[PDB]
Design a binder for these strands. Structure first.
Length: 218
RNA sequence: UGGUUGUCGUCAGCUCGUGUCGUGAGAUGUUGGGUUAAGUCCCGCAACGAGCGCAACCCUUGAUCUUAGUUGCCAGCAUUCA
């Protein structure tokens, strides 16, 4: 674990008191996360992600934070599961039907590029249907092949991704969440008390879940 | 009284559904950052590509192609006052 920077939390002025149960001491005006609770909390997560994948359940990684974007993506694609990496769209889950309508439309613009329909209309169309595609793939490229709602979310930094959390709860979707000290643990079903700010930390902890999907599929 | 006249005729916006926010009336998107002649456009953002009015749809003029060459046209030939 801590070669990767997981133990390091946020400062003391931005704690949440519910994270007291997961904190072991403050040093240079930063809380330290208790690695002996982490490991067990990572192990409990790992079994819950393993069991869920073996039932054929679909997990949606969600890391819009600059230090999760690439991590999430690489680990979602490796794991053959959905991601959101760029911006969580209001009503991604609750309003899933109206997103589905743009996943159709994105896939419909691709088929227009693949049949050479883009050579018949132009110049005006093509500008605005690349521009629509570029924009749609950006935001919806991770969830492109998700036909039905995910059976759980893997979140990173719930306090940034509040909307994703808020949504998941409203559909009783289980969530799996890297919480730093700042973050409320009670929102989340399976909690991983850890750094979300350090790239190695996230990359480590996502990868172990990805692994946990891959080992179920075997 | 009908109808038809004059007379305030453009002059400024209304939104996609569901989702979201409030006990509720409502608010959001359709408060922000630039931009345009603009009711424009991009970037936004618990709202998400983009919608109706606008414009266009009608008619006319500006270039050129295809078809049609007669009663139109004559460059190239015969002509003659033409």
């Amino acid at each position: 674990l801590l070669e990767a920077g997981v133990h390091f939390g946020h400062q003391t002025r931005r704690w949440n008191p519910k994270m007291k149960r997961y904190i072991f001491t403050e040093r240079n005006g930063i809380y330290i996360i208790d690695l002996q609770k982490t490991v067990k909390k990572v192990e409990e997560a790992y079994n819950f992600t393993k069991n869920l994948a073996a039932e054929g359940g679909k997990i949606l990684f969600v890391g819009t934070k600059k230090q999760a974007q690439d991590s999430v993506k690489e680990e979602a694609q490796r794991s053959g599961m959905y991601y959101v990496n760029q911006r969580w769209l209001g009503g991604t889950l609750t309003n899933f039907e109206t997103i589905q309508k743009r996943i159709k439309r994105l896939k419909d613009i691709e088929k227009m590029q693949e049949n050479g329909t883009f050579d018949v209309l132009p110049k005006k169309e093509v500008v605005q249907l690349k521009k629509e595609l570029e924009r749609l793939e950006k935001f919806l490229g991770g969830i492109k092949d998700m036909k039905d709602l995910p059976d759980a979310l893997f979140i990173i930094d719930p306090r940034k991704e509040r909307i994703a959390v808020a949504e998941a709860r409203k559909l009783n979707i289980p969530i799996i969440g890297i919480v730093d000290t700042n973050c409320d643990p009670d929102e989340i079903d399976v909690v991983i008390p850890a750094n979300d700010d350090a790239i190695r930390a996230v990359k480590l902890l996502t990868s172990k879940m990805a692994d946990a999907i891959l080992e179920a599929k075997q």
